[PDB]
């Protein structure tokens, strides 16, 4: 169900347990079911929620992603308000073990904890993806500069500052595709990255010919320009495809 192996491993068993509890609650089964003392299990949840918000706050302050800074605090409120209902429900159940409003608080609280934790993981994941897209867009912009290269000196400068960006993007895509649960999207990412990687020496070779045809002042210039532009076009189309699949 979840798009990442990490998100799936964290949320799927707790989501299924809550879905089962919600079903029992709406069927009327929870209402008169004897509930043991929940002071300690709820205290363990409040301690875990406090640590998630504290670690979440450390990310908000040290990050530069303004969407993550904006979207994490409403989710902190959500998990904390959910925790409030669980702490209060445990108290209410000690005074009245048959409390129907307290059982409602247990379900709303558990759902709120899940929903808020899910929001936080999805926000954190979207920010990690935005880091990869930034790297992709930087390469796209750098590829728009290939047509400016017209001398040997330009070619050396250009190639030198292209090689690391490509290596960085390939490493990021390789690590990301291994995290995805959707196998068809993993195939799209790796195949697009294979195309970009293999077209890089094709682009460098076309730029070398372009520089040589320009210097010799021969009839082969238009074909050299067309071969370079077509390679920039294909690489750019593939990087735009990677950005699209990364967001899915």
């Amino acid at each position: 169900v979840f798009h990442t192996r990490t998100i799936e491993s964290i949320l799927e068993p707790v989501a299924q347990q809550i879905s089962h509890l919600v079903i029992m609650h709406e069927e009327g089964e929870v209402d008169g079911k004897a509930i043991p003392d929940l002071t300690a299990p709820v205290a363990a949840v409040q301690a875990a929620v406090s640590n998630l918000v504290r670690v979440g706050k450390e990310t908000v302050q040290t990050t530069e992603d303004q969407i993550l800074k904006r979207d994490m605090p409403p989710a902190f409120i959500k998990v904390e308000n959910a925790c409030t209902k669980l702490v209060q429900a445990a108290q209410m159940l000690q005074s009245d073990p048959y409390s129907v409003p307290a059982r409602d608080y247990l379900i709303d609280g558990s759902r709120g904890i899940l929903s808020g934790t899910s929001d936080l993981l999805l926000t954190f994941d979207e920010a990690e993806v935005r880091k990869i897209i930034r790297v992709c867009k930087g390469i796209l912009e750098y590829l728009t500069v290939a047509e400016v290269v017209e001398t040997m000196e330009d070619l050396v400068t250009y190639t030198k500052n292209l090689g690391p960006g490509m290596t960085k993007m390939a490493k990021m895509i390789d690590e990301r595709q291994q995290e995805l649960t959707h196998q068809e999207h993993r195939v799209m990412l790796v195949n697009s990255m294979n195309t970009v990687k293999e077209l890089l020496p094709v682009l460098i070779s076309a730029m070398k010919i372009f520089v040589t045809t320009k210097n010799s002042k021969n009839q082969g210039i238009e074909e050299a320009l067309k071969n370079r532009n077509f390679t920039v076009e294909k690489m750019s189309a593939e990087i735009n495809e990677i950005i699209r699949v990364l967001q899915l």
């Binding site: 964290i10 079911k33 929940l38 299990p41 934790t117």
Partner: peptide, 27 residues
């Protein structure tokens, strides 16, 4: 790292909530 610390914190919330839901659901 900050990523590992955040993920471990979320895992702890899921685990403690799972244990609470299992205790409520208990027949």
């Amino acid at each position: 790292t900050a990523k590992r610390q955040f993920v471990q914190s979320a895992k702890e919330v899921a685990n403690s909530t799972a244990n609470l839901v299992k205790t409520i659901k208990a027949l």
